Ligand binder design. Structure first.
Ligand SMILES: NC(=O)c1ccc[n+]([C@@H]2O[C@H](COP(=O)([O-])OP(=O)(O)OC[C@H]3O[C@@H](n4cnc5c(N)ncnc54)[C@H](O)[C@@H]3O)[C@@H](O)[C@H]2O)c1
Ligand SMILES: NC(=O)c1ccc[n+]([C@@H]2O[C@H](COP(=O)([O-])OP(=O)(O)OC[C@H]3O[C@@H](n4cnc5c(N)ncnc54)[C@H](O)[C@@H]3O)[C@@H](O)[C@H]2O)c1
Ligand SMILES: CC(=O)N[C@H]1[C@@H](OP(=O)(O)OP(=O)(O)OC[C@H]2O[C@@H](n3ccc(=O)[nH]c3=O)[C@H](O)[C@@H]2O)O[C@H](CO)[C@@H](O)[C@@H]1O
Ligand SMILES: CC(=O)N[C@H]1[C@@H](OP(=O)(O)OP(=O)(O)OC[C@H]2O[C@@H](n3ccc(=O)[nH]c3=O)[C@H](O)[C@@H]2O)O[C@H](CO)[C@@H](O)[C@@H]1O
Ligand SMILES: [Cl-]
Ligand SMILES: [Cl-]
Ligand SMILES: [Cl-]
Ligand SMILES: [Mg+2]
Lengths: 345, 345
């Protein structure tokens, strides 16, 4: 059978997706440059070594950079792909503002190179990791797919928006292409085994991992970025979605490609928003630990609330997020507890 | 630190700007890969060989691709540039629609690589070839710099907008950068000698070379892309600007950089729009020939009408386009007539 190329597959979302692909019967080939994934010293990134263990199925892997055209060329010659799921990229907002060129290079040039090879090799079937960030500051809520996109505030968000645009143009230009752009909301949680999850290096920029790190006792308290927002409790409201649900949405997307769907765009969110305080309360509950916090200044670029209108995905992808708040917290806690320092032995 | 690097210097706008540079006392270094240029009889592309003749000055040139990192690196090690004028890229609205990836690769990836090399060598002064296409479908006329940018109608325009955006980000991250973004309107005309001008390969994509070719009898007739636009005669309205005036605008831009201007954006237009039909008329008058045209469908990617508000350039660059319609046609005609087959065969 033909394979499924998974770029950046050793990462957070990708590893979970590889697991789901294997469980669903697909044959994945992962490529990763270890920019944000732990090695271990063996042939696989630790995340994938564990996915193999958990599923009892092999993960084919090639260490490589999407910026390496020559390596991409050889890869497409070595394997017969039927689709590509593209997670590879840089995603640190703060870092993007500081080093815009790095983001444009990895994100834009890398994606362009990958699209050229796919075109060249006749693998015109893509699933792309996009983000609700492309919508910019919400003009209305919930955010549906027709909400305006662009006018992003940082280089990171801009790069995702530009990528979306490039893919739209490609599909318009060649009707034989099929591409599903998935706008993730706030991915959280980990596989139920507690053996894989998000492995942030240093201080996590996202709320959840910070909260769990406070709970585990690695951090003293949570700094809450403002409490004067226009929300019920004044703290920011987001659509947290279980990474496992998110991963399953990728399989639904592959199925969509098989229907020769052309260019499709879907939000991958729950449609339910929770505030920072509500997330802390739930994590207290899942962890059985106290989670102290302190209200600090607002974070530059943050908005009051951001949550999805997941109807389209349900309708067309037949996908809906299954796991709730408690499950997300329980699963995150399990991973955190079982792996206090993330990956290694 | 004396030289000025000119990418795509063998092309239409580039060759003319090389000439103005020489005459203004600058020391240009030109690089071109001949995608849309004519390899002379020697090393130099024919255009530059002629430029040398006209100016009595020498042109340093190096054949290379902005896509070649290695070559760029060497180049920047070889010379000490005080600034860069970046003309290299793909430039047709309609063709972009059918070939988005080529535009994205050459324009975006080419520009990013260029910017990385510049930054890495402390060459932080730039003159960029932007376009009125970044304004997308005009919301009002004439177009001032503050008119919204983005929401482009074609990949070419999207590519230019994205580049503008990246540059703005770069300048933010590094205050020491000086970058002048020139939104050219429709370049036309030719050097007064008739020795150089636009030398399109195959069927001309743009209005004037096609019109002129009909006149010299190289084309049977002109195809007019739609007559149902919201314009006086229903045909496309554009701000045609003489290539010589554009070139002079570039010297003014180089001067602007001396003020440690940072990020600046200026329209380079005349402020006068002309219809497709009006252009034909003017060329009929200039060539005294018969110019037959067939009305056809609207072309994907084209806007109805667009012309510049050139106040800002006037005020800040101390620049205005002098050359009028008759002059542009006479100049275009002279070049066409003296060079019926372009720079050679
Ligand atoms: N995590 C989120 O909250 C979030 C939200 C929306 C969208 N996204 C997007 O989803 C994707 C996956 O996000 P994630 O949370 O799993 O991040 P991640 O960093 O864990 O995974 C990305 C993977 O890409 C690899 N990579 C980076 N640059 C590479 C390159 N040049 N070549 C090859 N591999 C390279 C990294 O080493 C890493 O394993 C990213 O594109 C991200 O921008 C994530
Ligand atoms: N031409 C217009 O009507 C217009 C108006 C707005 C913006 N611009 C821009 O100004 C620039 C020059 O326009 P022009 O009319 O002179 O076009 P042109 O095609 O004559 O000039 C572009 C030049 O770049 C060279 N080139 C292309 N790809 C290259 C690569 N990868 N490496 C090196 N050289 C390469 C081509 O060979 C050519 O000599 C382009 O960026 C164009 O988009 C022009
Ligand atoms: C500016 C920024 O980072 N935007 C990113 C962030 O948005 P986003 O704000 O949605 O997600 P975060 O995880 O960073 O924050 C969620 C909420 O928690 C708050 N919070 C967060 C961390 C913390 O220590 N304290 C605290 O109070 C934030 O203000 C917000 O209200 O995550 C999305 C998912 O990765 C990305 O696509 C966005 O690009
Ligand atoms: C190839 C070229 O130089 N394109 C330039 C032109 O774009 P632009 O697309 O406006 O230029 P064109 O010469 O292709 O089009 C001008 C007008 O002429 C019409 N037309 C054109 C050709 C033809 O055979 N028949 C016909 O009717 C078009 O529909 C349009 O209304 O100016 C822009 C700035 O404004 C530049 O950024 C572009 O680089
Ligand atoms: Cl294979
Ligand atoms: Cl940078
Ligand atoms: Cl293409
Ligand atoms: Mg409003």
């Amino acid at each position: 059978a033909e394979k499924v190329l998974v770029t950046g597959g050793a990462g957070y979302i990708g590893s979970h997706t590889v697991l789901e692909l294997l469980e669903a019967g697909y044959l994945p080939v992962v490529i990763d440059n270890f920019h944000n994934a732990f090695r271990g010293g063996g042939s696989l990134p630790e995340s994938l070594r564990r996915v193999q263990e958990l599923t009892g199925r092999s993960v084919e892997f090639e260490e490589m950079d999407i910026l390496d055209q020559g390596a991409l060329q050889r890869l497409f010659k070595k394997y017969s792909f039927m689709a590509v799921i593209h997670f590879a990229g840089l995603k640190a907002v703060g870092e993007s503002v500081q080093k815009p060129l790095d983001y444009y290079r990895v994100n834009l040039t890398g994606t362009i190179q990958l699209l050229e090879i796919m075109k060249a090799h006749g693998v015109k079937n893509l699933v792309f990791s996009s983000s609700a960030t492309v919508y910019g500051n919400p003009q209305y809520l919930p955010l549906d797919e027709a909400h305006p996109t662009g006018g992003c505030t940082n280089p990171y968000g801009k790069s995702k928006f530009f990528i979306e645009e490039m893919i739209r143009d490609l599909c318009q230009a060649d009707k034989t292409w099929n591409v599903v752009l998935l706008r993730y909301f706030n991915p959280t949680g980990a596989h139920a085994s507690g053996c894989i999850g998000e492995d942030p290096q240093g201080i996590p920029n996202n709320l959840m991992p910070y909260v769990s790190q406070v709970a585990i006792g690695r951090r003293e308290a949570l700094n809450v970025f403002g409490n004067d927002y226009d929300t019920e409790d004044g703290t920011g409201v987001r659509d947290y979605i279980h990474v496992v649900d998110l991963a399953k949405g990728h399989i639904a997307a592959l199925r969509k490609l098989k229907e020769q769907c052309g260019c499709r765009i879907y939000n991958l969110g729950t449609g339910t928003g929770y505030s920072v305080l509500q997330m802390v309360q739930a994590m207290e509950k899942a962890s059985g630990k106290k989670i102290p916090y302190k209200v600090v200044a607002r974070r530059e670029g943050d908005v009051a609330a951001c949550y999805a209108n997941p109807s389209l995905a349900q309708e067309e992808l037949g996908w809906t997020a299954a796991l709730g708040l408690d499950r997300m917290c329980e699963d995150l806690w399990r991973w955190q507890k079982q792996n206090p320092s993330g990956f290694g032995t």
